[PDB]
Amino acid sequence: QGRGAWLLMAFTALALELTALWFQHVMLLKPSVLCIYERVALFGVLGAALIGAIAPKTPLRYVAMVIWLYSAFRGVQLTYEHTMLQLYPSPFATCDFMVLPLDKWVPQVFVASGDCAERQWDFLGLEMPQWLLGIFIAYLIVAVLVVI
């Protein structure tokens, strides 16, 4: 309910969610695929926290909650289907396109050129492209709880 509280959550996500780009390479994973669409949910919720971060007090822009609520939920819907697409994959082994990027700094944060659901074996402790459902539940569940 203060600059610190908001900045912690904005930091924790910018940090926790940016780490996403780390290890990607040695993992022998690389392809975000649908994930780029989902990466968006991070700046959606982080956007709100970092924009509302101005101070969760004097500034009435509290709207930060709804946009935080929206992006946290929007993240769950897109991540959930992604989880389902593994514990339940579809008949279209083929990939989409067979039936707003670019930016002065670097396109890196987003990418899709590589391949489809193929070898992907992860083997890292307990996967990770699905742990994200719980993590977004946390932001959403923090968000619902503060505005109930």
Epitope: Y88, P91, A93, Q120, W121
Partner: antibody
Amino acid sequence: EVQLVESGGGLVKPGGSLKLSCAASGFAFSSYDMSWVRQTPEKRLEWVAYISSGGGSTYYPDTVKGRFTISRDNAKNTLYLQMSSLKSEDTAMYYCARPDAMDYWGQGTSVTVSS
Amino acid sequence: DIVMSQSPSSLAVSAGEKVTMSCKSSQSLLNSRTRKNYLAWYQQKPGQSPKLLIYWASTRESGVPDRFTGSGSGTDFTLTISSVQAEDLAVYYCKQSYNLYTFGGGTKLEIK
């Protein structure tokens, strides 16, 4: 408990057209996906179309892709198959199925193509 | 596409026996992630819509008597019906759902 009754189709001429509707009744319609299976006169079984839960994506075998159109309307709980440029190959019985693996099948509308 | 092909066309059996017809697919049906064999068996009674019988390859469906069993893995599936009741007159169809939907030709289990 859960029902499907497709209907609305008999004879149609080559190059012809005709639209069938599966009247769905007794399950959370807008939540499942829907499919359209036909069965040839040889008793053969071809899958024909697939629409996603929220009408979003559709899919077809190349053998009807272009000529066939799997719409739905969860307002009036109906599934639809809109057949166009009708080949006399299309001549078959037409089941409307439910997946989660077709677990509740209809009963068929026979459709024949002839002159 | 994938081609499903069952043998034989027909089976006779005296009411109460074990029968194991076979479904073979042109393409392996295994995922790397989970042994998940993406084949189904549908039974279809004379002049009836097919009924779901076994999915994934092993797992039976709500109200399937234990007697129908699904073995198989890779390109090689087998359906097995012990204690053939009279109300088991049918053609048994295998379907792949690994890449689009294809069906076998069918196996007619006619009674003695």
